[PDB]
Structure formats: structure tokens, C-alpha cells
Amino acid sequence: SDLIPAPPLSKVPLQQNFQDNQFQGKWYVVGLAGNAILREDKDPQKMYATIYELKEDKSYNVTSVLFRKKKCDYWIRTFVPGSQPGEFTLGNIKSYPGLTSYLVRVVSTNYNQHAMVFFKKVSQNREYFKITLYGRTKELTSELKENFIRFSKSLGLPENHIVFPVPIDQCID
Amino acid sequence: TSDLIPAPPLSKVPLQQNFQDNQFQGKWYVVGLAGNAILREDKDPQKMYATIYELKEDKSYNVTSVLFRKKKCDYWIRTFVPGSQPGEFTLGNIKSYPGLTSYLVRVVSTNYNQHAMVFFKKVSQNREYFKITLYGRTKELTSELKENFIRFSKSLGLPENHIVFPVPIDQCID
Amino acid sequence: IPAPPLSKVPLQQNFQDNQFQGKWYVVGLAGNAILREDKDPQKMYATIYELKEDKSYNVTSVLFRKKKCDYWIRTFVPGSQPGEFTLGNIKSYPGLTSYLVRVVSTNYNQHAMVFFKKVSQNREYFKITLYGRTKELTELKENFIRFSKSLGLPENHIVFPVPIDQCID
Numbered sequence: 001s002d003l004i005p006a007p008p009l010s011k012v013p014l015q016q017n018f019q020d021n022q023f024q025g026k027w028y029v030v031g032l033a034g035n036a037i038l039r040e041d042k043d044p045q046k047m048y049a050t051i052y053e054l055k056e057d058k059s060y061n062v063t064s065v066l067f068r069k070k071k072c073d074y075w076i077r078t079f080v081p082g083s084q085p086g087e088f089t090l091g092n093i094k095s096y097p098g099l100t101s102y103l104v105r106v107v108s109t110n111y112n113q114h115a116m117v118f119f120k121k122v123s124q125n126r127e128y129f130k131i132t133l134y135g136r137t138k139e140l141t142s143e144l145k146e147n148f149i150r151f152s153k154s155l156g157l158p159e160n161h162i163v164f165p166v167p168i169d170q171c172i173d
Numbered sequence: 174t175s176d177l178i179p180a181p182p183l184s185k186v187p188l189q190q191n192f193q194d195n196q197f198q199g200k201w202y203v204v205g206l207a208g209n210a211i212l213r214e215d216k217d218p219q220k221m222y223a224t225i226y227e228l229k230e231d232k233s234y235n236v237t238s239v240l241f242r243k244k245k246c247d248y249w250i251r252t253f254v255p256g257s258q259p260g261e262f263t264l265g266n267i268k269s270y271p272g273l274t275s276y277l278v279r280v281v282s283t284n285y286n287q288h289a290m291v292f293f294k295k296v297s298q299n300r301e302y303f304k305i306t307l308y309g310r311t312k313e314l315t316s317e318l319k320e321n322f323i324r325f326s327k328s329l330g331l332p333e334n335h336i337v338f339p340v341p342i343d344q345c346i347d
Numbered sequence: 348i349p350a351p352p353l354s355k356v357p358l359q360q361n362f363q364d365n366q367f368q369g370k371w372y373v374v375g376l377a378g379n380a381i382l383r384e385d386k387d388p389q390k391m392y393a394t395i396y397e398l399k400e401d402k403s404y405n406v407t408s409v410l411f412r413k414k415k416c417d418y419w420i421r422t423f424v425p426g427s428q429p430g431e432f433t434l435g436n437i438k439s440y441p442g443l444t445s446y447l448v449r450v451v452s453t454n455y456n457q458h459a460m461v462f463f464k465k466v467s468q469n470r471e472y473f474k475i476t477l478y479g480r481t482k483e484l485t486e487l488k489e490n491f492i493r494f495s496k497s498l499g500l501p502e503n504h505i506v507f508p509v510p511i512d513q514c515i516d
């Protein structure tokens with residue numbers, strides 16, 4: 001259960017002049033990396049989607065949709081704006097048992113095609129982190145996948161902690 | 174005495190099709206700046222500034238320019254009133270600007286979430302000035318976009334020494 | 348304007364001398380003694396590279412001038428590294444103590460950039476040519492302008508010769 005440490009926040013860029021309206025809608029998880037994310041060849045990770053809706057109060061309603069055990073699973077969360085535009089905290093955190101901390105930081109995006117987002121959580125006093133490569137479609141270029149691999153490794157993650165979920169049709173369209 | 178490159182006819186200045194006023198709001202950095210009274214100065218190069226567009230209830234923009242000057246943040250506040258067609262504006266309360274008889278704004282192109290080019294024309298002391306700004310949501314833009322902006326500026330009659338790329342800074346505009 | 352240090356002039360990696368041969372049109376031309384003559388802008392010329400048995404190039408420049416086709420013939424001898432050349436029989440050029448050629452980049456079948464440096468009367472001249480297999484190029488003109496400026500040259504030292512039909516076809 002030992003973990004690769006979370007990198008210091010100084011190694012995680014923040015998207016300059018983040019546009020919260022432009023970031024909204026559905027994003028597909030085309031890449032996923034983290035200290036508790038592990039490549040499994042026997043049962044490879046299926047792609048899921050995360051949907052961001054801006055509320056009147058500028059927090060996001062965030063719905064994660066996955067296909068799991070023959071069903072569509074839905075996680076509905078609230079992202080509250082954080083210290084800087086492009087950062088978020090999880091709303092009503094006390095209703096998640098074990099969870100003492102949950103940070104979101106958008107690293108880069110061009111809004112209409114791709115994004116990279118960094119997440120850090122403390123759960124049972126264990127510090128987990130992950131990075132998602134988002135696409136507005138289910139596919140992205142080599143170039144972007146490679147940049148995402150390089151960025152994940154710059155945060156201390158080896159190859160086996162970096163996965164490219166297999167596109168599917170169920171639940172996420 | 175003043176000698177000015179003439180303003181181009183408006184037919185040489187495109188208009189962004191189906192302009193989305195809500196999407197054009199927020200902060201834009203001035204990454205490129207060209208005009209008949211804009212001059213490159215190597216001794217004291219132009220610092221980057223930002224312009225912030227807020228849509229009002231009545232669809233005019235509140236427009237705030239933020240510059241770093243003499244060690245402080247300077248703030249210019251104006252109003253852009255919608256014009257003949259979407260993407261064009263006039264300056265509100267023009268009589269409070271002494272000498273100013275005319276001021277036109279036309280958004281040439283934008284993709285809203287990264288870049289824009291805006292054309293401005295004003296008549297001040299009966300002198301016809303114009304400029305073009307290359308806007309970015311970030312402080313940097315691609316070669317491709319800078320070159321496009323250079324080409325467009327030249328298509329309106331401006332030589333190289335009337336086209337500048339303000340140097341990125343952190344003070345005031347972050 | 349001073350010649351830039353050679354460290355600011357790339358060399359084409361793994362230069363293919365056979366593939367570089369044939370006719371190249373001079374679509375761009377820049378240098379510290381090249382000046383836009385705006386009143387009567389310069390005509391395009393061509394430069395033809397023929398590989399000899401001994402791997403030197405026979406290099407023929409063809410211009411249209413005074414109603415005639417003019418021909419300048421020189422020899423480029425391979426230098427320290429593939430893609431670099433020296434001028435052959437340099438001692439027959441009076442005043443010329445040095446002449447270097449360095450191919451900066453090329454894709455062989457469309458475009459190239461070549462850097463030239465010479466010392467003549469103890470004055471250090473340099474120029475850069477943008478070569479095309481055709482008389483027109485794209486993006487590539489802008490790249491050539493930015494490269495020329497990276498070596499210290501302003502806009503007025505960068506020219507785009509006008510395409511013509513006489514002599515160079």
C-alpha cells in the first residue's frame with residue numbers, strides 16, 4: 001500500500017486566465033495517470049466521461065459516468081471555485097467518509113478539443129493524485145498523448161501508472 | 174504638424190460573422206498592437222497590458238484597460254455601445270473626451286477562448302487614427318497568429334515599424 | 348551588419364549530396380550587403396548544382412541581365428562536415444581570403460536554405476538563400492524571414508526576387 005508521493009504543487013502548472021464557461025460540457029477521459037492508477041492487461045480500464053455544468057453561483061455541477069458491472073454508474077459532485085481561477089475544491093466534503101481534502105487544478109486546455117486536469121485527495125490520511133487527459137472526442141493525437149505521458153512522468157509516475165482507457169459506446173454518449 | 178498613414182476604407186476590415194457578445198467578455202491580453210500612431214521603440218519597449226470586457230444588462234460593454242506605468246497600475250474605463258451590426262461598437266459618452274469626434278470599434282475575427290483581432294478608428298482634433306489589437310486569453314500566441322496579424326496590419330497599409338508585440342509582464346494584468 | 352557566429356547557423360543533419368543536386372530557384376535572398384531596391388526590385392535567378400565524380404559540385408548561376416542570359420560558374424568543394432563547402436580555386440578570386448557554404452535545412456524535393464559567408468578585402472559579408480524547386484513557395488517565406496532576422500538582418504536586407512521566364516527555364 002506504499003504510494004508514490006504527490007508532487008509539490010509548484011510542478012503542476014495552472015491554465016492562465018481560465019474560462020469557466022468555455023470549460024463546461026462533456027469531456028471524455030482519454031488518458032488517466034496516478035499514484036493509485038495501475039495498468040491491468042487482463043481487464044483494461046474502460047473510458048468514462050465527466051460532465052461540467054456551470055451553476056448560477058459559478059461552482060460546477062460535475063457528473064462522472066462510467067460503465068461498470070453491466071450498468072451505468074453516476075457520481076454527482078460539486079466543484080467549488082478555489083483560490084485561483086481554474087482551481088476547485090469538492091463541495092460538502094463531510095458527506096464523503098474518510099475524505100479530508102480534494103483539490104482540482106486545470107493544468108492546460110484549449111477548451112474545444114483537449115485538457116489536462118490534476119486532482120489531489122487525502123483519504124484515510126493517504127495522499128492520492130491523478131491526472132486526466134480530457135478530449136471533447138474519444139480520440140486524440142499522438143502528440144497530445146505523448147505530452148501527457150511526459151507530464152505524468154515529470155510528476156514522478158512510471159509507465160505502468162499511465163493508462164489510455166479503451167473507447168466504448170455504453171453510458172458515455 | 175502630424176503625418177499619418179491614412180485609415181483604410183472599412184471595406185478592407187472584415188467583421189466576425191455571428192458575433193457572440195457574451196462569449197467575447199472577460200480579460201484579453203494585448204499580445205500585438207499596430208496602428209498609424211503606434212511606433213516600435215527599442216530603447217523603451219511597450220509593456221503588455223490587458224483589456225477587460227463586461228457585458229451590461231443593456232448589452233453595452235464596460236471596458237477596462239489595465240496598464241503598468243510609473244510603478245503603478247493605471248485603469249482606463251470606457252463604454253462600448255453596440256453599433257450597426259453585431260461586433261461593431263461606438264464609444265459611449267463621447268463628449269466627455271475632449272477633441273474626440275468619432276470612435277469606431279470592429280471585431281475582425283475571434284474564436285473567443287484563445288484569440289481575437291479588433292480594429293479601432295478614431296478622429297481626434299480632426300486627425301484620423303487607427304489601430305489593430307491582437308488579443309490573447311494568454312500572454313503568448315503562436316507564430317501563426319502573430320504572422321497573420323502582421324499580414325493583416327500590412328494589408329491596411331502599415332509598415333513593420335508600426336507593428337509591436339508588447340513584452341509580457343506580471344504586474345497589474347495577472 | 349556583423350556575421351553571426353557559426354553556432355547560430357544550423358547544419359542540415361545527414362546531408363544527401365546526390366539529392367541536393369539539380370536546379371534550385373532563388374525565391375528568397377537576404378544578407379548584410381543585400382538591399383531591397385524598392386524602385387526596381389531584383390529578378391529571380393537559378394543556381395544549378397551538379398555532383399562531379401569527385402563529389403565537389405559544379406555550380407552554375409543563371410541570370411537574365413542586359414537582355415542576355417549570364418552564366419557564373421564556380422566549384423564547391425566538400426568541407427569539414429557533410430553539407431558544408433568551400434569555394435574551389437579561391438586564389439583566382441582577387442581579395443577573397445575566405446568563402447564558406449553551409450546548407451541550413453532542406454527537404455531536397457521542394458525547398459532549402461543555404462548560408463554563405465565570405466571575407467573580401469578583410470570585410471566579412473554573409474547571405475542566405477531560400478531555394479525552391481519551383482518559383483513559388485508557401486509559411487516557408489515567413490520561416491526564412493524569421494531565420495534571417497535571428498542572424499541580425501532587418502526587413503530591408505531581405506528580398507524576394509520576382510519570378511521570370513527568360514534563361515532560368
Ligand SMILES: [Th+4]
Pocket residue numbers: none
Ligand atoms: Th475518484
Ligand SMILES: [Th+4]
Pocket residue numbers: none
Ligand atoms: Th486610446
Ligand SMILES: [Th+4]
Pocket residue numbers: none
Ligand atoms: Th558572390
